[PDB]
Design a protein around this ligand. Sequence first.
Ligand SMILES: O=P(O)(O)OC[C@H]1C[C@H](OP(=O)(O)OP(=O)(O)O)[C@H](O)[C@@H]1O
Ligand SMILES: O=P(O)(O)OC[C@H]1C[C@H](OP(=O)(O)OP(=O)(O)O)[C@H](O)[C@@H]1O
Ligand SMILES: [Zn+2]
Ligand SMILES: [Zn+2]
Ligand SMILES: [Zn+2]
Ligand SMILES: [Zn+2]
Ligand SMILES: [Zn+2]
Lengths: 113, 389, 389
Amino acid sequence: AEMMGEKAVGTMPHALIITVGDQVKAWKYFDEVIEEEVPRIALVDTFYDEKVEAVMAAEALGKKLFAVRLDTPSSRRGNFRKIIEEVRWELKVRGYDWVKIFVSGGLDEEKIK
Amino acid sequence: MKRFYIANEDEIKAGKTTDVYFLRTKKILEVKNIRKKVLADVTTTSLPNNWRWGVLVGVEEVAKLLEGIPVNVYAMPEGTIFHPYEPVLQIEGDYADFGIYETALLGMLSQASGIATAALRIKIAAKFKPVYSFGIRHMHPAIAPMIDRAAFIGGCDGVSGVLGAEMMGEKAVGTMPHALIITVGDQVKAWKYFDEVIEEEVPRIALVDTFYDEKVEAVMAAEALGKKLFAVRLDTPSSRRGNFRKIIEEVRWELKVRGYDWVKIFVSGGLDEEKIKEIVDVVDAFGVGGAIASAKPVDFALDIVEVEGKPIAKRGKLSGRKQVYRCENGHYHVVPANKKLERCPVCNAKVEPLLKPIIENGEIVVEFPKAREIREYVLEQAKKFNLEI
Amino acid sequence: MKRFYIANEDEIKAGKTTDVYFLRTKKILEVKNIRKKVLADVTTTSLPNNWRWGVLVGVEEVAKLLEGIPVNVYAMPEGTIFHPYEPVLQIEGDYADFGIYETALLGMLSQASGIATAALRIKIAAKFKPVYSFGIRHMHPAIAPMIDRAAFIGGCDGVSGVLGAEMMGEKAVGTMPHALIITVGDQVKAWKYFDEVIEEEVPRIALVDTFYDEKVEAVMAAEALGKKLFAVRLDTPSSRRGNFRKIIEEVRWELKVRGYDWVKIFVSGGLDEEKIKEIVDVVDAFGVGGAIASAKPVDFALDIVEVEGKPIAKRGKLSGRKQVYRCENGHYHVVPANKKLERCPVCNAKVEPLLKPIIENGEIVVEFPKAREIREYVLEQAKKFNLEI
Ligand SMILES: O=P(O)(O)OC[C@H]1C[C@H](OP(=O)(O)OP(=O)(O)O)[C@H](O)[C@@H]1O
Ligand SMILES: O=P(O)(O)OC[C@H]1C[C@H](OP(=O)(O)OP(=O)(O)O)[C@H](O)[C@@H]1O
Ligand SMILES: [Zn+2]
Ligand SMILES: [Zn+2]
Ligand SMILES: [Zn+2]
Ligand SMILES: [Zn+2]
Ligand SMILES: [Zn+2]
């Protein structure tokens, strides 16, 4: 980032949530400890389904939750598209609508298209 | 006692045909007494062959099943074009009460919807020309009617099944068997006997291909009953169908050359969409069997999406009580019931709700349309929405 | 009057469910009085997906249908492995008498045979491990039993359907629904209630995947009832099945690591041969639905191959009265009845006739084996003949 003159951005590791021992407690600690200028994207999928952990992250920090990250493991990606939609729904239904969908995890052109 | 492994109307209405683990579910709930109100959804995450749309069928029988049971049943009008993830029917009440009716209700919507969708697609592929259901011979007679009634609602002009025809209020149509011509021992003598013995209101289609080539027997049937010969039927056996299209043309020619021009070409015999598409423009009417009767069911599933006004559903299932709004341009939209549409998100148009109450506390608050008018509904949607095969 | 579009046992035995053109055939023949003795054959020119063999099913119901009718009915023992062009059942008499029973008899042999063959193939693909029929939810309840009875004869160890289980003389097995766990509101609380409320003779398989990952809920179910947990069920939704194999292993691991080693892996959920083949060696028992219940019928057809001792059949159909000889090495041989085999054309062995009399002039000259013993017959053939999927 530096050598270019840019700020290296990022989100949350699985390690953080696992060592802290609790999803909610984890992204709570992140919300408080890290600077405010740092968008807060919650690393959903860890123990519970993305659908479940997504709303949890919403009903916590609520408007502090800039986005939710989906990185479903390959053994679990039956239909990423569908999975992504289901999250958007469970969020939309429960009135959470500002939270965006951020994804990462082994993807190329065809997968992104 | 019972000579056929079928279920009696009572045993089904009873719930004797369900999966045991549902009975055991009523036990746990009843004993440990866990009574509570839930809203269950009926949808599919896919349609056979990954088709884009399907034809809803069976809403009737389902009402006649949950009839007189502690629940509410909202639904889409039978024959409605639907899609994956869109609830085609909902149920509200104590799971402990209706949960023992999944095995039956889903089966009722599933196979019917399957056959219908199949049918409508064939209709479309046949450029809406006439198509007659002939497939009940490939399935158990017990369901002979549900099938023909589905092929019908699906777009089939007529039905082969007798008992099935009636229950709908239709005349079962048909043609000539190979047995007739073979026992009678002579092609000509056979369709002559048919011309005289059978009523006059019955179109007379000659079963050509039997011993001689279709080309030969076609003219014979023409130079006999001549103007009494409404059509000729071609059902070339697979071992003989080198190029059905070509064979169909050759018949038309040999007939046209010899001045016979009123006789139409009616075909039947193991054919689906792709097969019909390559032969529509040269055939007058289609006889379809298995592709419609043996069509694949729609993987319909019943899943609780809300418990006590609380939005909750398992993995891969949508949560909450919802409605599906359809505009006159076929654009659908599934949204939460907590909101209400009026404008069509896409091409601004008036949109109307599809989930409507059909059973209020075990009471069927609706009059169910007769088959033919539902079928009227399917074909209108097909054309209005410009459905594509 | 009737609340479901099904046919009553009487209407079927009557012949009210046939294709009109068969009635009209009786008219022509009866009126113009063309009575004569004929021998009709029942075969297929192909099996679904161009499979090599199929499992014969329905010989029973057919006898109970032609019962009390002016004809003879020879057949192969229900459950027999058969092939294309080999008559699985014959009928002798005045076509005018039984001809109105094609629509019913063919459907009876066709769909059953279809489901059975499907089942047996699944059995084989699963390395004969246990497989339980769960598919009746995708078809009409009216036929719920015929199906489960077919999945059974096919090789399925157990059946989900209650009414279907009984009529055979079997106990309908099952596990846990998603509804149970969701209404109860808690995974653990749910399978706890099940462990206490349900009988002890009922194996206890925990329905894992619901809200949490299978990996998480698997151990939970273990650290609860511990040695009461006979098995864990995996039915990952399609949107979640990235690599079922891998998912199945991960569960086995997380269980093995935490010292739980008696708990087996039971899976179910949209699976066929290819899917099972890629997961057999890591699963204990299979739960199969649609691939067996919604299996495709066997294109069975009834064709007169002889009229008045005279050999005659239409195009693409074999002519004459014949028999099929089978040796103990599965080598089949269809030959004319005018001749008799004793030696097996191939590996010289003793061969025995398959077409045997079952109905003498409307009189059922046979006692029909109970389901389970027929099934005994299928699996024995599968192994003896070394059937390949
Ligand atoms: O598309 P399919 O599923 O094959 O079925 C469609 C037709 C053809 C077949 O009869 P044919 O073999 O054409 O003649 P017949 O009635 O004389 O036996 C069957 O009885 C239906 O009438
Ligand atoms: O192979 P298929 O035709 O898909 O069906 C096989 C299984 C799975 C499905 O239930 P699940 O979706 O696994 O779970 P649940 O019974 O709780 O609805 C169905 O009720 C049968 O038990
Ligand atoms: Zn992850
Ligand atoms: Zn023919
Ligand atoms: Zn619109
Ligand atoms: Zn599941
Ligand atoms: Zn041999």
